[PDB]
From a paper:
Human leukocyte antigen ([name]) B∗39:06, B∗39:01, and B∗38:01 are closely related class I MHC allotypes that nonetheless show differential association with T1D. [name] class I molecules consist of an allele-specific heavy chain that is associated noncovalently with β2-microglobulin (β2m) and a presented peptide. The α1 and α2 domains of the heavy chain form the peptide-binding groove, which is characterized by six pockets designated A-F. In general, two well-conserved primary anchor residues occupy the B and F pockets and are located at position two and the C terminus of the peptide, respectively. Upon identifying a peptide that binds to both [name]-B∗39:06 and B∗39:01, we determined the respective X-ray structures of the two allotypes presenting this peptide to 1.7 Å resolution.
For elucidation of the crystal structures of [name]-B∗39:06 and B∗39:01, the peptide selected was [name], which represents amino acids 320 to 328 of human [name], LRR, and PYD domains-containing protein 2 ([name]). Thus, to obtain the protein in quantities suitable for X-ray crystallography, [name]-B∗39:06 was produced in mammalian cells as a secreted single-chain peptide-MHC (sc-pMHC) in which the [name] peptide, human β2m, and the extracellular domain of the [name]-B∗39:06 heavy chain were joined with flexible linkers. To enhance protein stability, a substitution was made at position 84 of the MHC heavy chain ([name]), which leads to the formation of a disulfide bond between Cys84 and an additional cysteine introduced at the second position of the linker connecting the peptide and β2m. Consistent with the finding that Arg at position two of the peptide is a preferred residue for [name]-B∗39:06, the structure revealed that the side chain of this anchor residue is located in the B pocket and makes polar contacts with B-pocket residues Ser24 and Glu45 of the B∗39:06 heavy chain. However, in our structure, Ala8 of [name], and not Ala9, occupies the F pocket and forms polar and van der Waals contacts with F-pocket residues Ser77, Asn80, Trp95, Thr143, and Trp147, while Ala9 is solvent-exposed. Superposition of H2-Kb and [name]-B∗39:06 underscores the 8-mer peptides OVA-8 and VSV-8 overlay with the first eight amino acids of the [name] peptide with RMSDs of 0.95 Å and 0.84 Å, respectively, over the eight aligned Cα atoms. This analysis suggests that the covalently tethered 9-mer peptide [name] binds to [name]-B∗39:06 analogous to an 8mer, with Ala8 occupying the F pocket. Additionally, our [name]-B∗39:06 structure suggests that for 8-mer peptides presented by this [name]-B allotype, the residues that are solvent-exposed and likely available to participate in interactions with a cognate T cell receptor (TCR) are at positions four and seven (Met4 and Lys7). Consistent with this behavior, we found that Val3 of the peptide forms van der Waals contacts with multiple residues of the MHC heavy chain, in addition to a hydrogen bond with Tyr99.
Residue numbers in the entry: 323 to 333, 999 to 1097, 1999 to 2275
Amino acid sequence: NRVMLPKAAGCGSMIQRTPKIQVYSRHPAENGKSNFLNCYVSGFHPSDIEVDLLKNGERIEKVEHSDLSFSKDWSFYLLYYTEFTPTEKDEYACRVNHVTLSQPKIVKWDGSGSHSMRYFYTSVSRPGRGEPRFISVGYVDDTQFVRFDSDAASPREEPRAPWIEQEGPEYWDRNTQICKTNTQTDRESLRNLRGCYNQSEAGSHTWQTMYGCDVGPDGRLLRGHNQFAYDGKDYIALNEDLSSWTAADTAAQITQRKWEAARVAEQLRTYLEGTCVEWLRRYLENGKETLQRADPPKTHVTHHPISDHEATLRCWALGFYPAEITLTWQRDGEDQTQDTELVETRPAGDRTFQKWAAVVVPSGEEQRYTCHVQHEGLPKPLTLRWE
């Protein structure tokens, strides 16, 4: 359940991040069995992006995508997907265009007891094209359960998980109202922030908000969060004591003084210690058969010679939930952090996640390397060695 957010105060630099692209199937592809083709685009900023799935060079028409969300560094991620039945010869790919790319990039298809709730908000101004685009999503751990999009035909808080559908009309009305109010608050924040940095109305800017709570196995608050970012950079954050702010620059300090006088932190603390933890506890009980079940990774190692004297060892983890995982390659038990290539953890589309880690080793020394896997679904870490 949401909270109404404060407005940045009236009184420049901008991050650009290039998308990371992975193309893959949800489950091992079968030459005659239905599957899902996934294109996962992550780590990018700003949020404007174009993603198409290709079949034999042709653009696939019925492609869905996940609701815009972002990672701790404020960078965005999206999953694009479609059901498909792969064949021996049909060739699939993903094409991505973004301001950081000089041409569209084509990639060919080759527990613990602790929990969290987060709401993520993204407002993006659209100069000359109407009002800002407002998109908000809510998560329990790595399970999305609501979304709100100001460009929907009838914008409202919408269910995205089965265990939230039982909430009554008061819940949907209340959270829809909070979203609609926050849309207008964000529009006012964007206007105020332009003034703080002497920016005209002609440029597009991004205002992102996150808040939420972490609880332990007994349901107690472990810590609360509320942070804001402008154009991809930290702007102001509630400190861990839930009683003070950290402001990134002189503009944000003006907001800090306004929110101090308005006792914003006290209101957020009240929400984080009460409503946030109480509703998270409710969701964990109502969705316990999925939310309180950890799925351990299914793991294996592959081996690819790259020359007469070196080979690639790749450690795969598949089908795990929640998304947090650690894959490490060791030589004689010592971490090879510098030499290990990792990919961003990616969604299969069915709640679970996937990840791999690779290392290049001298041919003949493969047996001195082990892959170490840590996941909360494992009683103890797993170790794998190539045969």
